[PDB]
Amino acid sequence: MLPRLICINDYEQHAKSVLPKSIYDYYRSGANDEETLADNIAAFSRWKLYPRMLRNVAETDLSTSVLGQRVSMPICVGATAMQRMAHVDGELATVRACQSLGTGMMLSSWATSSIEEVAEAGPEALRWLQLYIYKDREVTKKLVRQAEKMGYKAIFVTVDTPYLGNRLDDVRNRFKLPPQLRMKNFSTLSFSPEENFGDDSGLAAYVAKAIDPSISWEDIKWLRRLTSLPIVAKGILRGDDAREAVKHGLNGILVSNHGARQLDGVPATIDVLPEIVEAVEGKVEVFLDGGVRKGTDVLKALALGAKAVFVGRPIVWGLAFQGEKGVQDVLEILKEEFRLAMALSGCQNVKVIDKTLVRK
């Protein structure tokens, strides 16, 4: 046949058909027995919608803002590493699609494109940097300074990866970068497949060499002093940690279990979102990622108090289909599904999406 891909799941199925197994598995995988991976999706199904009828939904407006910057929809691209494994244009394709859509891209720290290259490809795109605190704080500071210089509008500091999760397929497949690719923002720090990264997942060994497992809230204080950019804590799952992030002067929480790729057996993000929204008392924006595949997922997250959601894997499946055009397709599908879900539930804009729309 000819691909007729009409929902995000179709893009995944296409991706599985065209990508090398090792690459598909790297993108697909969760940690260990993948309990949380299943739950990120199943949990959305347990939250039921209570639509209002007869509200006038002729002129649905999906626009909102993220950390003070306007976006066309509350659906943004989350950090996924090494996008050139899915399509030759990788992160440059992604940022161009975001520019077209009027939404934001969170650039991953082990991107196969540089901070500068991505800014050059998407100068008008809303762009943020996802950061790890590397053992080498000079590396870390340089990334932040480059993000500042190159027009990025926030730092998302990932806090759930002091070590890499155990993704069994990567170990089985002995996963590594294809030989032509590198992490472009750093030989060892660039994750060269030529370097010695052990006999298991090359990625886990790389993380153990690069990322600082000793970081504490003291290092958050350091990062807060380092930059005036908005900072979002990415990977928070507890209310008490969320309150600590507010106390440290951070500007947002991304409720995330890292796409279920870190600690397996944590709750679904949609299930912990209410706890986190309650804990921060409106003091910072709260975002969600993990398991967003459909317009109704977006609606449910916003009903429970998220400002916006991020999508990880769907973007990679877009790339695998057709680079920039494929990412645009995936974002347009999510946009249209969200528009329809809003309209059928009686919501003419995002400001009227309330907690009475959902019940578990």
Added chain:
Amino acid sequence: MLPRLICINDYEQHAKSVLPKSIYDYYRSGANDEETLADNIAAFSRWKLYPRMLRNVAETDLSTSVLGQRVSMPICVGATAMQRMAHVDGELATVRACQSLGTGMMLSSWATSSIEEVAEAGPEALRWLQLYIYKDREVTKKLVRQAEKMGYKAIFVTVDTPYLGNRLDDVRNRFKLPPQLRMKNFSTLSFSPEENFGDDSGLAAYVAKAIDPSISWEDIKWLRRLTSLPIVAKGILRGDDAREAVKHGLNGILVSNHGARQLDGVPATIDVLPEIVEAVEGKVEVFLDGGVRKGTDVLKALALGAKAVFVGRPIVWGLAFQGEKGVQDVLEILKEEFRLAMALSGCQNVKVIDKTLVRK
């Protein structure tokens, strides 16, 4: 073999075997991942029956009334569009079967038979019109006036379809009317497969051109002033909306998720029915559709306070089997299953079907 069809599921299986895939899929489909479609049936299974013994059930009486009109049983035909796709006689077959059974038919607004043709075929049948408020209010008013003139006894205004739900199979199949058929109560308004209805579901584009997504409770006020016929709000899932319908002088609520074909992830109708019954405080009759396949489904709905239920898909499967005779068969099966369920639970008539008969 020779078809030996003894329950509603058997009629569906037969229909799948004889109908073109596109047509079967159109009839079968729910929206998106079909979560609500599954739940409309699963939810009935979770409500358990607590039968009373030794009550004298020798003379079971299934008769009741709907909006003041007597019916032989609390089981009525709900609106399903384009019935001539299932059988050459379509809506005329359906109304003749309803006349034979002594129950009512809700005629769909995109029927493949006219309001007048259906009245001529079933002059003695209890008949109601399901209405959409079209952008063209002159079209809308004409339908209501024809229903009045031709002896229809209520208007069911559908309020859950400002836009059509996303039924994936219809998009995959590029669904449209077979070339010989038309919506007979209106070229574009008649959903001619010759007209330009985009490259996706022809139906969704038709709805977007025809149905007014701007309607509000103000338009309900208009409809209430337009006709003295009883008006039922079809597609209500919230208690607050139900109370608003009562406040606007409507005469009934049809608790409906549109056969799970509109917003996916809403609750099953049997699960929201108690909320709606409580909210209206006996001021109007409350009806249910969605997932009724068996006599015990009918019993459970009445135990939870519905006056009557409507069946959608089962009627189409009856048509696909043998037109009028097939619809009669399906209605007789539901009637007999309901009679048996009543008798085995100790209910000699519908007036003694109480809330103590069920527990979730």
Added chain:
Amino acid sequence: MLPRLICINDYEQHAKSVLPKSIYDYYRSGANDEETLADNIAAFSRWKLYPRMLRNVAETDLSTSVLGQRVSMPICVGATAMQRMAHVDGELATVRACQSLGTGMMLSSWATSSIEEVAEAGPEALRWLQLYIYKDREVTKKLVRQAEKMGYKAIFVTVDTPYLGNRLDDVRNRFKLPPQLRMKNFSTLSFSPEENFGDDSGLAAYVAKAIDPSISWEDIKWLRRLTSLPIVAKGILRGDDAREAVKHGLNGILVSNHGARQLDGVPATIDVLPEIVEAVEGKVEVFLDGGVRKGTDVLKALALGAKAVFVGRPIVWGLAFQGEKGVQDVLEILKEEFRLAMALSGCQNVKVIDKTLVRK
């Protein structure tokens, strides 16, 4: 292979392999979609055991009493019709096995052996009669008088079958007695396969002609006056009905959903048992049937207050394997499994099986 049957499920599997489909299906079937049939077994699995350690279980005593008559174990044979369809010796085989085991047999009213024949085969066996109130009360009275004369020790009046449940396989199979067999306690009343019993289940038509659907508590008063034998109401699922049975001077409740063959969607018997035990306030013995397959099922029922349980289908599978010897095997397996369950839970006799042994 050679049959090595070590649990009740193995006997069912053997039975399916040797019985004609129509006969196996008749025995196996539940009503309609068989929701309750599945639940009778699943519900036992949800009740968890909390065994006591170090109690001294060297000398486990399984003996108890039923309505004042001693039995070797709280596991008795329930009424299953037409046992000669499973084995040439039918009910005579069953009663001989009960005599050997020291347990009781409930003789079914549409038995393929007479009340007298069964008494002659098992003179020392504890025997009870399961009764329906026939439209012909002279038939009914004669059965009771024969039970009295022939040394039967109780009447179990079945109250959940004013009409037969709808067992789909029987309708599909057009089920009837094999030509050589008859209901031996009555041509039409004997369910002769030569007589006209419609085009569906022959059994349903027979029931409609024979059993009185008009019976009320007034007919229970009649039966109570008719005989001084203990009377048990069989098929009660509600506490209020249980209290009424006590008020009418009956001597026991058999909590039963008729093996899930009557109204589908009623609860599992193990789930309603606590309600019934509470409702009767120790005034009569309470028994259970439905889904008993294992020694732990027996233990759970007794923990929740049943005096004894009855088994239906397992006995038929015993017959299908090897008549009397097969029934003895099934009863011995249940006995040994129950003994082991008692011992492993710290119970040296049935008097110390308490409600703290289980939690749902």
Added chain:
Amino acid sequence: MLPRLICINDYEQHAKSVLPKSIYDYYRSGANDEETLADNIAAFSRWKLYPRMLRNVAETDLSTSVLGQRVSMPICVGATAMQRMAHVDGELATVRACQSLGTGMMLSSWATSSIEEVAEAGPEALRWLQLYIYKDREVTKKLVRQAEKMGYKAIFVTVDTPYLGNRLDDVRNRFKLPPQLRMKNFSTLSFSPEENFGDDSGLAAYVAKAIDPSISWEDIKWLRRLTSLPIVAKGILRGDDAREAVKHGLNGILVSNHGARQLDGVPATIDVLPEIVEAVEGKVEVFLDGGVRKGTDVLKALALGAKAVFVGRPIVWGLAFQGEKGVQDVLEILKEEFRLAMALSGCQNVKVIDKTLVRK
């Protein structure tokens, strides 16, 4: 292929591929329908983890103590009988691996190696004896005295096996020791496959001849007087029994359902653990076995108050793969998974693993 075994489940799959069916089944089996066997694993999945971020996990310390003896990790080898069926070196391989890992081995009473042989093989290993109270108390006392003499540091008295559970596969397979092997701490008491152990499971008959089903708390008093070694009650599932064990001067509870091999339908050990921890009020250490397969299982057990966990079947799968090296592999996998789970949840040592880390 070449075995690439990276998690405990992989070791089981390998074991199934290389072991004779009878032997694999003996090791694998639970009792009866294996409801508890499934639940021991499923229950761990229902307990969700709530990880703390930014805690400094650069120097994770897994060490703890069991009954006053230091161990490298809270993961110890539980008693599994007849280990020479899995590998020629059996219990000697196991103890050598424990010595290498710095963890403890619980030697089973029907070991295929003597108490002395195991001590000689693992002189520096932490070793405990699992004891049954045999009808012959002289046998029983001799085992305890040998454990004392040979440097064993505790007695685990198993209290849930007055009789053996009914493991259906063992009965189907007519299980017995391979001809070259014996229980080395005792012809009949040595479970010689040459002796008469009935026609079912040889093991059940052996247990019935050897183990005293009459034991009570009075026999616990006897054992407590017999030895000054720490004594742990193994197989407790109720809080009241746990309190009795404390009252009798025992030094620990091993919350255990015997790997789901005794009474089927008891709860999962992880589900009863909180009840037991609460009941003993910190007076003795509480341990868990049953269903531990992953590092997150260990973390969940410790969060709910277990001091350490024991693993049964995983060790046997290690042996089946490669004797001592295979056991070492399995223990190292559990160690590393536990280290990662600790780090990703913010725990730098076992003392900070608290109840707020989990919610059901």
